[PDB]
Structure 1
């Protein structure tokens, strides 16, 4: 057991191992209560997040366990991973606080997409790294569900990692109106048309790639219905085959009220873009999710010729999420969380 010391931070007393020095607040609270620190063991600048009294309800106790399982699983260059996890508690009986230690990624895609001139070669490398990460994530049967520029960390060398695992489900208020949180969502999840799957994440990659090429949001809707109209104007109204797959009868009736529209010509929308980037955008932004390109197929597309290495695009160990369908008491979720904390083995 390491030696711990105390100091006053973000309105509570933090108790952390001596290895973590020069703690000070960072971010706007998007990902929780977070300080930056210097890690004397690895030499990295790190983010330390404190979950205080997080076994306060069944929902919160299950969420805590979920975030710890997902972060412990993810071991990939283009994905956020767990450097360390700790509690100052000496036993289960006094266990109350969880601290997570992850790589400190200062800038996101939002802080360079607007304030910088991105060449075609920049767009190739950034989207390449998102798809390499996604291939890994999807091989574990994990769906991200929230890919957007603020969830992508980028350094001065244009190296990228994907964030946002096992946090609270976004609320109905968070998805209302003129908001970035909805602009990247696949239409089948934004309107609950059907049971969604990992294909929702490829729609999000399409919206991100378009924005890097044009400097503008692809579908900046003022509400769910305004956004749907922007989508259908680009990709066309649904045909008979997709309409059959929309389970909600009410959603199907609404769709059939709209005047039919053809798919637009993407070379006249993305004027001047690499024709290989136009072709890839057409394969991601397909309304029928069954027909979208997969992350694994997209990595082999000609647009990524100068980056693609099929011997360096790894897949994930299998990820058991049977806990997702399990009903437990607060103290049971808390005990499983304590076991995951004490069993943690750090990376090389």
Structure 2
């Protein structure tokens, strides 16, 4: 084991190994906190995340295990992955803190180039999100909360997806209507909806469906895509949902060409295929990557899929000490990248 050093940051103590220097708080909240650090053993700059109260409850302990398993699994350029994972703990018995390490990214999509993002910037960014989603979706993982603050980018416009599979600017703004209005049954194209919303925003400078609550939000969405016809209305189980929607007079579906007016017509068509209510008819990430709007970036030989990922743990009901020991084991078996 390495040599650690302790230190208190933003009223947050940190006990990390010597290899990481110049810790400097970058972000925080409920989840825990993140510091930018310099990693002396490889010359690279990293982000160190200390989980907040990793084993305070069964739900905490399970989410901790969930995050570590997710992160150890993802190996892709457009998906945050694991450089290192460590604990001060010298034994299972002492184990109470988890720190996760990944390459440092510059900012998130809220605050990063132009005011007018430019259509080629748009192309590259959305291309990278779709390529990351492709990988993720291929492991039967779904983001569920995809949005600009979960998309990290570099000054070079390199992009990585953050916080995927954890939700087991405003979130509601980018959420697919089917999971928004509670649906246990949807598919991975919920994340494509969000992509749609993000893409629109970039191109346009304004949030596509702002919305002050779930009702205002759904109203804003039907205005653009139009009320569900009888074809889609057949797949809505709840009288509840079906009565409200059938309760509002039909809204026609708008001409996207006129909403996003003078955007690249290729952009608009793609927007048209992503922002469909029927989640059965919504384009998937692998299909979107083959749309013409990305002819300049698309490369079928370099848009890999994930190895199979075992989330059998997810239906497991265990005690905190079982989740905690599961997590400790994953720390101990961690193999850094080559």
* Equivalent pair of 1:23/1:37 in contact (CA under 8 Å): yes
Deviation readout 1:81-109 (Å, 9 max, x if unpaired):
11100111121111111111122213111
CA contact (8 A) 2:143 2:167 kept: no
Deviates more, 1:124-133 or 1:31-40: 31-40
Deviations along 1:162-209, one digit per CA (max 9) or x if unpaired, are: 11145566xxxxxxxxx7121000111111145122110000000111
Which whole-Å CA distance do the structure 2 matches of 1:165 and 1:292 have between them?
20
**1:124 equivalent in structure 2:** 123
Taking structure 2 as the reference length, what is the TM-score of the superposition?
0.96
Q: Secondary structure at the match of 2:127?
A: helix
Distance of aligned partners of 1:194 and 1:14 in 2 relative to their CA distance in 1, 3 Å threshold: closer
RMSD: 1.6
Residue ranges of structure 2 left out of the alignment (5+ in a row) = none
User: In structure 2, the residue corresponding to 1:76 is in which secondary structure?
Assistant: coil
Q: Residue 33 of structure 1: SS of its match in structure 2?
A: strand
- Contact 1:194-1:245 within 8 A present in 2 as well: no
Report how far residue 211 of structure 1 moved.
0.8
Q: Which stretch of the first structure deviates more once superposed, 244-253 or 58-67?
A: 244-253
Shift of 1:127: 0.6
Q: Tell me, which stretches of 5 or more residues in structure 1 are unaligned?
A: 170-178
Contact conserved, 1:25 with 1:36, CA < 8 A, in 2?
yes
Instruction: Classify 1:167/1:202 alpha carbon distance in 2 versus 1 (closer, same or farther; 3 Å).
Output: closer
CA distance in structure 2 between the partners assigned to 1:201 and 1:168 by the alignment: 12
User: Distance in 2 between the 1:28 and 1:117 partners?
Assistant: 29
Distance 1:31 1:46, change over 3 A: farther
Q: Distance in 1 between matches of 2:30 and 2:129?
A: 21
Indicate how the Cα distance of structure 1 residues 100 and 193 shifts in structure 2: closer, same or farther if over 3 A, else same.
closer
**Other-structure match for 1:174:** none
For residue 184 of structure 2, give the secondary structure of its aligned residue in structure 1. coil
Q: Which moved more, 1:328-337 or 1:36-45?
A: 36-45
The alpha-carbon deviation at position 252 of structure 1 amounts to 1.0
Cα separation, partners in 2 of 1:141 and 1:57, compared to 1, 3 Å: same
Cα separation, 1, equivalents of 2:164 and 2:272 = 29
| Cα offset, 1:150, TM superposition | 1.0
Deviation (angstroms), 1:333: 0.5
TM superposition shift of 1:159: 1.0
How far the C-alpha of 1:213 sits from its partner, in A, is: 1.1
The normalised TM-score by structure 1 is: 0.93
Does structure 2 conserve the Cα–Cα contact (< 8 Å) formed by 1:236 and 1:263? yes
How much has 1:28 moved relative to structure 2?
4.2
Cα deviation, 1:186-237, whole Å, max 9, x if unaligned, reads: 1111111451221100000001111111111110112211111111111111
1:296-346 CA distances to partner (integer Å, 9 max, x unpaired)?
Answer: 011111110110111110100100001000111111111100000000000
Residue 50 of structure 1 aligns to a residue whose secondary structure is strand
Q: Does the 8 Å CA contact 1:71/1:165 hold for their aligned counterparts?
A: no
Judge conservation of contact 2:115–2:205 (CA < 8 Å) in 1. no
In the comparison of the two structures, how many residue pairs are matched?
338
